[PDB]
Point group: C3
Chain length 340, copies 3
């Protein structure tokens, strides 16, 4: 080790609310720590850093991966958890977030929140007096992108993040697209957002990310042209075209518009890269074995929406590794911020 201890010190007791709050080196540290926790777990060697800690998991919206990842990470690390689901949160109905935060802060050692506006999780993080972690808001999904970056490194045969190029296809203005962009800029990556112009991320956020990328040697491109957007890419990433809490009416105008950005074998071919890999944050509509995906695909005469079955189940697909990595990276966040 000639490895700087600065980042571990600086992460203690921090919140984890969005990637904008962290430096390039803090993010890289979290990723490295994830890889170490993953290896220790696989070897049966894990040391518990959250022993006797109690954590509250507030979910104002649904979750499989994120909830499970927080629970399993906590359990592995010796913590106990209270899961408060959508019909359990009183928040903003009967009790303010300020009040809730102060009450939970007195009983728990750490708090996860998944919900609506970034402003809510920021208020929670300002008032709880303990580390608060964002498990998804309307604007950002930071833990997902940690997982994505660990996954890219593992699947890149020695290449660093600064050296990787990737394209995100579809609706770029969603939490995942925003976080991928902030992330790419911070780590010095080359990201292409490839989708209809009306769904590019907020201009203000793009400009802040362009400024970050200039200092890190990263690169950000927005385009409607699939062939140009995906050329040379190591990874292709997509997500369901409609977000959590949006009405079924959102699918009316979006499909014909989003259709040309579907990830299919042809798109993988246009990368020119036989080693291209496919990523997706999940859940995905890639066949008819989903009630919603079946009806929508049928309604518009399709077989799979944002990605096809052939791509999803091909050897190019690394979605299940990526999913597993949610737990390891969330573990790193809790260990760095709350671990002793």
């Amino acid at each position: 080790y000639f490895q700087s201890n600065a980042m571990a010190f600086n992460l203690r007791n921090r919140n984890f609310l969005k990637l904008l709050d962290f430096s390039t080196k803090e993010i890289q540290f979290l990723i490295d720590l994830s890889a170490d926790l993953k290896k220790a777990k696989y070897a049966g060697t894990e040391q518990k850093k959250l022993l006797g800690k109690n954590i509250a998991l507030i979910f104002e919206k649904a979750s499989t991966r994120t909830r499970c990842a927080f629970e399993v990470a906590a359990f592995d690390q010796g913590a106990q958890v209270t899961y408060i689901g959508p019909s359990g949160s009183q928040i903003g109905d009967k009790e303010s977030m300020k009040d809730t935060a102060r009450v939970l802060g007195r009983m728990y050692d750490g708090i996860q929140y998944r919900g609506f506006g970034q402003a809510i999780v920021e208020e929670l993080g300002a008032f709880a007096g303990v580390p608060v972690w964002n498990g998804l808001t309307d604007e950002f999904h930071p833990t997902q992108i940690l997982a994505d970056f660990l996954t890219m490194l593992e699947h890149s045969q020695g290449k660093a993040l600064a050296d990787i190029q990737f394209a995100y296809l579809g609706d770029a203005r969603n939490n995942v697209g925003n976080s991928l962009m902030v992330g790419a800029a911070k780590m010095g990556m080359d990201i292409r957002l490839v989708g209809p112009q009306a769904y590019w991320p907020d201009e203000e956020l793009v400009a802040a990310c362009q400024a970050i990328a200039k200092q890190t040697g990263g690169k950000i491109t927005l385009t409607e042209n699939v062939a140009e957007g995906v050329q040379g890419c190591d990874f292709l990433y997509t997500d369901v075209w409609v977000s959590m809490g949006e009405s079924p009416e959102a699918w009316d105008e979006r499909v014909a518009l989003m259709k040309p950005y579907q990830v299919n074998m042809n798109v993988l071919k246009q990368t020119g890269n036989p080693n291209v890999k496919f990523m997706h944050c999940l859940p995905a509509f890639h066949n008819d074995e989903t009630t919603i995906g079946k009806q929508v695909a049928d309604k518009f005469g399709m077989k799979g929406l944002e990605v096809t079955e052939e791509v999803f189940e091909s050897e190019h697909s690394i979605v299940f590794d990526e999913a597993e990595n949610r737990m390891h990276t969330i573990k790193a966040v809790m260990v760095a911020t709350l671990g002793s």
Copy 2:
């Protein structure tokens, strides 16, 4: 045997041999005794388990949770809402995600095919806490209960009758179970509600190799004669209102378990069993409605039978936990 059960799924009794099942029951008895003596050894220490419930059932859920906790495991309960399951995400995808994070997975839900797909794709042991077709954990508990209440008689020596609607998961599983263990079972109920004929035939073939016996009849007196245990279950549909129940009630009524039926066994030591919940009085809102509408205090069983010295329903309910514990310990335990 112990070696052979490691990492198996527990999806239905048809997947196991007579001796495997007996091993599970024996292991249950041992774990029960160890718990009672304060002597229990934890075999699931460091294990994390996901409990998927697509339809709620607080009894099966509680048995999994208590069994896991006693054995040093931690659990994540995923109930009918708050998940992404059946609707936003396929079972194949869910299975592969959960399998990466958890060491074992319980599922309670709809078709056997779903729990089979989960079991084929998760990469870890998957346990069936109830599907439309089978309810294997309930029958383990039932068999342990019978052995405990039979003064040293083995299962092969026991005779029992199940009354009512035999065409569902508990009836199916009792029949598969009886056949495997060489028992003498009578299914006593209207012919239209006997189990699937294909399943009966497969059970008849099993019963031949084990010296078991299977009888289906509409005759109560003949069905219950000589029985050590009488078993029943709710026979109206829970998805339906008490207003829809007229036909089914009149049809099932003569198979009610009441004191007379116990008498017709000719066995003063006969015991009464029920998987629960049970409609045995007018204390509930649904019991009040039924009492008003059909002039009946209790449906499949009467209050007098349910609360009598013959009833072992609460021992049977406690045994859900000890048996579920054995399943997890045998398949995942270190």
Copy 3:
């Protein structure tokens, strides 16, 4: 000493089931567990115990308090939350209790009528703890009493005076009155007469108070009710499971019993502290509190933002104390 032995395996269903000294022992035990936790010295008395948490109505504080208390003490919990079926719809409480009692070492219940939790307590065969019913909320009042002692500079409970404002016939009002009487306190219930506690309960509390040197007063008069008080307490004017229509004819009636700075002033006590069981409607940062206040042109309902956020307010200490006191209950009744 005697009290510890006498509490083992008891239910905790209402304060009317305990003696003065048992309550004081619970409070003392709470303070000891609080200190042990803060010092990293806590001994786990509930190791290997499994506890069922039945919630038929919503909770933040009470659920969390039970979970954290159980975890700190080495227990594990199963949370069974509100659904479309209540116990008694399709399975009796008598059946449920006997099944849970075979699997769990202790059971919490929050729900509707006190008769339900009494039935659970009669049939479970293990200690059963009332986390709130229509009639009573006993764990809340333990927490309140610990909090008052901590904020009273060595004064005992018998020496404290406090007023509860608003709808006095709710679970918290009833339990504060039973509590005051048991511990020899001077309580004033200050609210419209139609919302005073049942006459049968008042009379039982008056008889208790007489032998403890406590005092109970009911009045519609704020000034006279709050004069000389160490603590002022209030709660939301409409209870859980009442219809949203209840607000409409209750706000105007309750409005004069709002806790605002004037009221604090009428105590004549510069050291007066403010308490609330929570949650509270004190500004526009909830959809319900904003809509109801807006309907009558108000800012805050039962308490104002200014009072809620002032140095007089000890509501967050009070909330933290829910956990320490719930822990005492479990440890005394079930703790090996």
